């Protein structure tokens, strides 16, 4: 039951407990968007206890979207919310309403910055028209270095090398049966 998770570079990763309910509950709350073929994003928020992280809250921030992108718009009000309740950012989640399950260059660039601050940060992608999903992270250090060094123009563009990976099963992410709270800040 004791897991030791090592990055490519030899760095140990702390455990993140993820409620079993989160993927299902996320798809439920963002369904009106999904049905209008609109991507939606969410934040995985939680707490540090005993050298371990717990995802306690799914937060749906103020955002804009298309069929192929979502993006937050008022991160200051989101900070305010997280700061007041002492919620850490441990990862994020978003939908591919019609696409397969993968991390795009847009998502990779977004997630790199989180993972650089928190080696354990994860990105969950839901592909509900395929009925698939996955939990991803960049290869550490090479994947992160590739994205940090990247200056390629274009919202979407390709990268050389593998860059990212699906988290190991089992891994530092441990899915548990647990309560879950969703906070929808949208207007």
């Amino acid at each position: 039951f004791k897991i030791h998770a090592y990055t490519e570079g030899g760095k140990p990763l702390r455990t993140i407990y993820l409620p079993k309910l989160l993927k299902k509950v996320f798809l439920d709350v963002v369904k009106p968007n999904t049905k209008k073929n609109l991507a939606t994003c969410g934040i995985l928020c939680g707490k540090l206890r005993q050298n371990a992280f717990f995802i306690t809250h799914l937060v749906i921030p103020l955002q804009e979207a298309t069929s192929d992108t979502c993006g937050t718009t008022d991160e200051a009000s989101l900070f305010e919310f997280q700061d007041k309740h002492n919620l850490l950012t441990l990862g994020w989640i978003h939908t591919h309403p019609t696409q397969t399950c993968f991390m795009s260059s847009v998502a990779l660039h977004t997630h790199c910055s989180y993972q650089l601050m928190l080696p354990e940060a994860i990105a969950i992608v839901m592909a509900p028209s395929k009925n698939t999903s996955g939990i991803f992270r960049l290869l550490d250090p090479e994947g992160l270095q590739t994205i940090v060094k990247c200056r390629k123009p274009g919202l979407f563009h390709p990268h050389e090398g593998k860059v990212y990976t699906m988290v190991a099963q089992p891994g530092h992410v441990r899915e548990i049966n647990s309560k879950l709270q969703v906070v929808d800040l949208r207007v």
Partner: protein, 76 residues
């Protein structure tokens, strides 16, 4: 002087700065140290989101002041 940038991931970045540094310049330093692009960064001090073209002294940011960093999220 030094200032601190607390992230929502539980980490605190320390930065050597001058009072006359623009917020833009502070973001570029965060890129140099942490690898986070400036356009993804939003910096907050005492309830105010800080403007790229203004300086630390314009917001009365002082030695050992703590700023807060929140990131733009984008997927798809």
């Amino acid at each position: 002087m030094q200032i601190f940038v607390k992230t929502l991931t539980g980490k605190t970045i320390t930065l050597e700065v001058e009072p006359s540094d623009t917020i833009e310049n502070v973001k570029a330093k965060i890129q140099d140290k942490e690898g986070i692009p400036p356009d993804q960064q939003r910096l907050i001090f005492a309830g105010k989101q800080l403007e790229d073209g203004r300086t630390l002294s314009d917001y009365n940011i002082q030695r050992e002041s703590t700023l807060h960093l929140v990131l733009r999220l984008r997927g798809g």
